[PDB]
From Swiss-Prot, chains A, B:
Descriptive protein name: Methyl-accepting chemotaxis protein II
Positions of region (The 3 Arg may form a positively charged pocket, which binds the alpha-carboxyl group of the attractant AA): 27-36
Residue intervals annotated with topology Periplasmic: 1-142
Gene field: tar
Coiled coil (UniProt feature): none
Localisation per UniProt entry: Cell inner membrane
Function: Receptor for the attractant L-aspartate and related amino and dicarboxylic acids. Tar also mediates taxis to the attractant maltose via an interaction with the periplasmic maltose binding protein. Tar mediates taxis away from the repellents cobalt and nickel. Chemotactic-signal transducers respond to changes in the concentration of attractants and repellents in the environment, transduce a signal from the outside to the inside of the cell, and facilitate sensory adaptation through the variation of the level of methylation. Attractants increase the level of methylation while repellents decrease the level of methylation, the methyl groups are added by the methyltransferase CheR and removed by the methylesterase CheB.
Residues of the full protein shown: 38 to 179 of 553
Organism: Escherichia coli (strain K12)
Similarity section: Belongs to the methyl-accepting chemotaxis (MCP) protein family.
Amino acid sequence: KSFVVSNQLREQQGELTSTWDLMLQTRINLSRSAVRMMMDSSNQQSNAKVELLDSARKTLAQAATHYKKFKSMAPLPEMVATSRNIDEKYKNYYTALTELIDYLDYGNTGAYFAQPTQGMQNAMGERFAQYALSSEKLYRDI
Amino acid sequence: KSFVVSNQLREQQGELTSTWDLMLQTRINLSRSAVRMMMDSSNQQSNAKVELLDSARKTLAQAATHYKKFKSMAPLPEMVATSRNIDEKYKNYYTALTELIDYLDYGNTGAYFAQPTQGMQNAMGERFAQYALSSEKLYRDI
């Protein structure tokens, strides 16, 4: 099986890297918007806060597109548990990120700061590292 | 050559994913610190601004460790140009990120906001996508 199966593994990793990366980029643009919503309107800097929130929204939608691609390539047997785990972490971090867009949609920075977002970022981050370790080891077995 | 060479390619991609990801995480923690340095001292939220700057510093040092690992696996002939390009983009974004740590080290948020960091983030991001496209196509040729 080795070509077809190991290429499947690389394509599942690429798509997951694209999902993780675009969620970190959503986190970044939500951050850049929240600081400008705190600084108010006099501040020359405050004025891009809606562009930034719009960029955040756009990269989350792109993370969700790559994730569905990732989910369409069925996990190989040994990959099933980390892939299940990734899905759990992914949904908690996607949701955190969605609620943050929802708050800034109406300028609620108080609720933005009150969400413990980093905890969820970190859990996905560790899931990602575990998926990547597990896929390297099947790839050097395939 | 196919096993040894295609494994080399996957290991160079993994290390580069680790570099890109840790630089995005440095960007995130610098962001979280800059907003708390803007909010001042009354603000319960302002008080983690030095922990956050310290986390940023730590993930940049980790991005630089994985990058040296990436650079130690010599680019295969067709990968030499994107690998050169990645190095250029990487150094401009590593430097941007370093100057941002340097500003927040003494609470200079004015200089933090004045740096056009995102432009450099974006150039590295496009380099990364181009490297990943080019490596997929050599990998399906190897």
